[PDB]
Amino acid sequence: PSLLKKLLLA
Amino acid sequence: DLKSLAKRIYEAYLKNFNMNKVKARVILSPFVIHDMETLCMAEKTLVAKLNKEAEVRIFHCCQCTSVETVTELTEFAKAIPGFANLDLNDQVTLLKYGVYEAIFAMLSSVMNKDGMLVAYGNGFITREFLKSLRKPFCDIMEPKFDFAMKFNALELDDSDISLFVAAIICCGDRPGLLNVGHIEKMQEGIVHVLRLHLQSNHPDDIFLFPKLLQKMADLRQLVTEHAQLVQIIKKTESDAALHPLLQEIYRDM
Ligand SMILES: CCC(CC)c1nn(-c2ccc(F)cc2)c2nc(N3CCN(C(=O)OC(C)(C)C)CC3)cc(C(=O)O)c12
């Protein structure tokens, strides 16, 4: 799991 | 709904970006950093203490600004109608290749011929002082100033730039995209709305839209050459530890 996915999933 | 697309994108622009053109133009009309002395003077008040070379200090401050802007660009893209409906992998691909094109486009709003704003509008570093730095740190912002000088001559406002940035993010040309036809449809709507907005906002320049199309191609080339400078620093500058989010963005670009 990638950091860009963290900003998109929030 | 495409009737309220320009208004919604402009509002998401004003909502998510701490710095815009009308705010930067107000400040540019604010401590000045023009040498090593004024740089240390500004850092005594705007940076917290918890040692590195001045070129690495400006490097870390600039890359930190990019990290916050990526977060703002992520939230901005979420407010674009249809973006949240895409697959999660497609949303990652659009942001990965789009953020730095939008960042250098938005960078023009805080740039003039003599320098750029830093530290959220609290500082102003001069163009010559950036060129007076050692290589390769002095070769970073110079091509961005050149792009900004031609881009600022178009005299766009925040309403124009908001649609321009939306068109940059919603680009069906990014490598590895899945729903290419639907993203192309999203781009078509944003570009068409941008076309009408440019016709209403800039009736004195009926060829402004093809000018902006060329700026999109200029930004992609400016980013690809910028990524080559990122790898030079990553490989030959140990003190310049690169942010993990920026590591993930530049990787496999
Ligand atoms: C190439 C390594 C890389 C580190 C990943 C880097 N090194 N420098 C640099 C270092 C020393 C210096 F003397 C001038 C520059 C950089 N400046 C950037 N810019 C872009 C956003 N930034 C802004 O203010 O963004 C708005 C206007 C609020 C949207 C100004 C700084 C962006 C990056 C970047 O690739 O991440 C970067």
Side-chain angles (χ1 to χ4, degrees):
Chain A
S2 54
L3 304 169
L4 274 169
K5 289 214 217 213
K6 279 40 162 194
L7 317 162
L8 288 148
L9 287 172
Chain B
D1 179 41
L2 226 64
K3 273 216 281 313
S4 60
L5 187 68
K7 206 218 176 193
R8 277 184 300 179
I9 275 147
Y10 184 26
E11 256 148 33
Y13 181 96
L14 303 166
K15 272 191 251 265
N16 287 287
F17 295 122
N18 66 63
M19 182 63 65
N20 51 53
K21 190 156 188 183
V22 80
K23 274 164 114 207
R25 253 47 211 172
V26 148
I27 299 169
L28 289 175
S29 46
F31 184 70
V32 174
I33 298 170
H34 61 79
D35 49 8
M36 279 317 179
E37 201 28 76
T38 44
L39 171 69
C40 300
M41 201 32 94
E43 293 170 300
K44 274 200 219 149
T45 325
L46 307 172
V47 199
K49 308 312 201 55
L50 313 93
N51 159 49
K52 303 134 155 192
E53 190 175 25
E55 280 78 10
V56 190
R57 308 203 298 268
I58 307 173
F59 157 90
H60 182 66
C61 167
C62 284
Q63 96 166 319
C64 277
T65 304
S66 289
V67 163
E68 331 274 11
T69 320
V70 165
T71 301
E72 304 181 327
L73 276 159
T74 293
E75 287 304 304
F76 169 77
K78 274 174 201 183
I80 296 175
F83 184 87
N85 293 136
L86 309 167
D87 287 300
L88 182 64
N89 285 346
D90 269 351
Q91 299 177 37
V92 174
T93 301
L94 289 186
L95 279 174
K96 171 183 185 73
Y97 292 89
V99 284
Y100 272 109
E101 293 182 8
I103 277 171
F104 294 139
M106 285 189 294
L107 181 56
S108 311
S109 297
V110 308
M111 278 175 155
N112 53 25
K113 57 174 280 276
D114 300 331
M116 69 190 232
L117 289 180
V118 289
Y120 307 93
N122 290 282
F124 176 84
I125 189 152
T126 69
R127 198 177 168 175
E128 307 271 47
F129 177 55
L130 293 172
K131 261 185 307 171
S132 92
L133 297 181
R134 100 157 191 263
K135 302 192 130 260
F137 299 95
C138 57
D139 310 325
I140 302 208
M141 295 274 99
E142 197 51 42
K144 279 64 151 181
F145 276 107
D146 292 341
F147 173 86
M149 281 330 83
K150 308 280 268 138
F151 194 78
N152 286 352
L154 303 176
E155 302 227 62
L156 311 180
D157 58 33
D158 287 309
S159 81
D160 309 317
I161 298 167
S162 70
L163 294 170
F164 187 70
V165 171
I168 282 163
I169 290 161
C170 300
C171 180
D173 223 352
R174 307 311 192 181
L177 275 183
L178 295 179
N179 210 348
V180 159
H182 172 241
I183 291 170
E184 278 181 354
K185 247 71 190 213
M186 287 180 54
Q187 174 159 245
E188 236 197 324
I190 290 163
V191 160
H192 169 83
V193 160
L194 164 75
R195 255 193 281 141
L196 297 146
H197 184 85
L198 293 176
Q199 150 268 295
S200 307
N201 204 24
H202 307 263
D204 55 325
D205 187 7
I206 70 184
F207 306 95
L208 180 55
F209 174 67
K211 293 177 168 134
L212 276 190
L213 282 179
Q214 184 179 55
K215 300 301 186 196
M216 293 179 86
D218 291 351
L219 279 158
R220 193 178 302 209
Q221 185 63 36
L222 186 73
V223 163
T224 46
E225 304 169 352
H226 178 80
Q228 295 191 291
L229 280 176
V230 179
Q231 173 67 22
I232 288 184
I233 285 138
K234 171 183 143 228
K235 194 180 258 215
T236 73
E237 307 281 349
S238 40
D239 256 346
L242 191 122
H243 192 283
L245 175 63
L246 308 191
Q247 257 145 354
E248 180 187 307
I249 286 161
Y250 284 115
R251 191 165 58 231
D252 302 304
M253 221 202 254

